[PDB]
Design a protein around this ligand. Structure first.
Ligand SMILES: Cc1cc2nc3c(=O)[nH]c(=O)nc-3n(C[C@H](O)[C@H](O)[C@H](O)COP(=O)(O)OP(=O)(O)OC[C@H]3O[C@@H](n4cnc5c(N)ncnc54)[C@H](O)[C@@H]3O)c2cc1C
Ligand SMILES: [Mn+2]
Length: 456
């Protein structure tokens, strides 16, 4: 990066908001995954959308890659600057606007986390449900297509993003559904909002997101249920979904993950394949849901429900920290997560096979995830210096991904592709799907400067 170029960047955002210092670039060259740090050539913090547009235009016309950066909690290397360039940290734009309680909508800028939003919403009777474990940027969640434990009932980011404000690679400002618009459904033109959800910073920079809010549940009950085997836990899950019980949360932990979470959060659940459940409704619709759900879990050997404000909060905090609980099994290690999502009737086969495969392998793996969506994570630990173990973990993850594709599923339910799953994506959608995705990338980013090396 030339001195003239750096000075041009400082003219847009101000000298304190541009850094070429090695330590600052290294901090923005990696996310939470094991993907190797690849530092950008500079980090820039735009202070408003006009500055985002002008930074993008400067980079784009000079042939300098752009890497959007939210909270850096991704797990597929999305922020790694594989071709160098300018990392745009968007978190100084942190305002909540256009809170429309009567329409159940709100507009947020990239520095707003879900925690910040739900704090702002206390005493409104509304909440935003999509809950990744990490305290992530909501616009980053829109960029990755995130989901979480609440998605089985309340939907993913794709279900809950109503509109996006996007700075395109050359600096133009796009409101995907129209500036200021919010509504429940539309057939007007092509749905641009869904194209940018899950685009991972390869099609443009999300500078605000319009989110669907939901009413807080009238009443909540959480519980855990221990099972004799993975098969019994996942069969119960499939049967709960087939019985159409509107469970609010249904999270699976294998015995390895349950033990890790016990040690990391000082829970002391029985070490066993376990479901964490939550039910929303009136005092009485809960009783109906509980009866029907306990009946199914009992048929599969589930324990009597161990029931759980503070107790529930510690239960789900432990679940949200499962990633760090797994890492704590081997201090100094990094982690790589699988994220397959299969048709629900095939979930028992692939989960049980994954458990058997982790057992037969020398790898440390913990299993957790959103089995209500037919989705789960195998969290695999890697010694950052053991090159052979890394090759074993990547091979394990790619074999699992190919098994999911063989079952009609997808290689990633929520984390995205980034650097890790590019070959699986090619297999998943085939030559015409890849070419079509690439033609869309090319028309929005002709010079290929919008987060190069990711997704495609
Ligand atoms: C402990 C832990 C638990 C997690 N649990 C979940 C979970 O349950 N569900 C889930 O889906 N994910 C989960 N994640 C992954 C991660 O939190 C999500 O992928 C989240 O959406 C990433 O947001 P971010 O701003 O931190 O992303 P970053 O790492 O900053 O960026 C991720 C990607 O999005 C792009 N990007 C970021 N912000 C923007 C923007 N404003 N405009 C355009 N592109 C942008 C980046 O260029 C990159 O390619 C977890 C992560 C951790 C560490
Ligand atoms: Mn998850």
């Amino acid at each position: 990066l030339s001195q003239d170029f750096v000075e041009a960047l400082k003219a847009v955002v101000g000298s304190p908001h541009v850094s070429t210092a090695s330590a600052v670039r290294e901090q923005h060259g990696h996310d939470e995954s094991m993907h190797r740090c690849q530092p950008p050539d500079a980090v820039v913090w735009p202070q408003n959308v006009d500055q985002v547009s002008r930074v993008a235009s400067l980079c784009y016309n000079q042939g300098v890659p752009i890497i959007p950066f939210g909270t850096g909690t991704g797990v597929e290397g999305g922020v790694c600057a594989v071709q160098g360039g300018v990392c745009i940290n968007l978190t100084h734009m942190d305002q909540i606007t256009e809170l429309n309680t009567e329409d159940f909508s709100v507009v947020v800028e990239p520095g707003v986390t879900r925690k910040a939003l739900n704090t702002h919403l206390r005493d409104s009777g509304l909440w935003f449900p999509v809950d990744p474990g990490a305290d992530a940027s909501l616009c980053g969640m829109a960029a990755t297509g995130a989901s979480g434990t609440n998605a089985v009932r309340y939907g993913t980011m794709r279900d809950n993003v109503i509109n996006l404000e996007v700075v395109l690679p050359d600096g133009r400002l796009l409101h995907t559904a129209g500036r200021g618009r919010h509504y429940r459904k539309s057939a007007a033109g092509y749905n641009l909002t869904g194209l940018f959800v899950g685009s991972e910073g390869t099609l443009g920079i999300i500078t605000s997101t319009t989110l669907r809010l939901h009413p807080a549940p009238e009443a909540t009950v959480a519980a855990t249920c221990a099972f004799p085997s993975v098969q019994a836990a996942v069969d119960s899950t499939v049967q709960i979904l087939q019985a159409a019980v509107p469970v609010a949360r249904i999270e699976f932990l294998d015995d390895v993950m349950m033990d890790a979470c016990n040690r990391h959060s000082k829970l002391n659940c029985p070490v066993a394949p376990t479901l964490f459940l939550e039910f929303h409704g009136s005092q009485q619709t809960l009783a109906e849901q509980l009866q029907r759900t306990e009946a199914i879990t009992q048929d599969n050997g589930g324990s009597h429900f161990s029931w759980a404000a503070e107790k529930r909060n510690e239960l789900w905090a432990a679940r949200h920290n499962a990633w760090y609980a797994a890492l704590a099994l081997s201090p100094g290690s990094k982690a790589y997560s699988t994220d397959v999502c299969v048709p629900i009737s095939r979930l028992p086969e692939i989960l049980v096979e994954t458990k058997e495969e982790i057992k037969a392998s020398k790898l440390t793996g913990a299993i957790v995830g959103h089995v209500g969506d037919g989705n789960f994570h195998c969290i695999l630990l890697v010694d950052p210096d053991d090159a052979e173990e890394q090759r074993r973990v990547k091979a394990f993850a790619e074999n699992l991904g190919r098994r999911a594709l063989a079952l009609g599923g997808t290689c990633t339910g929520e984390h995205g592709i980034g650097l890790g799953k590019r070959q699986l994506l090619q297999e998943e959608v085939g030559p015409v799907g890849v070419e079509t995705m690439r033609q869309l990338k090319n028309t929005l980013d002709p010079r290929g400067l919008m987060n190069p090396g990711k997704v495609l």
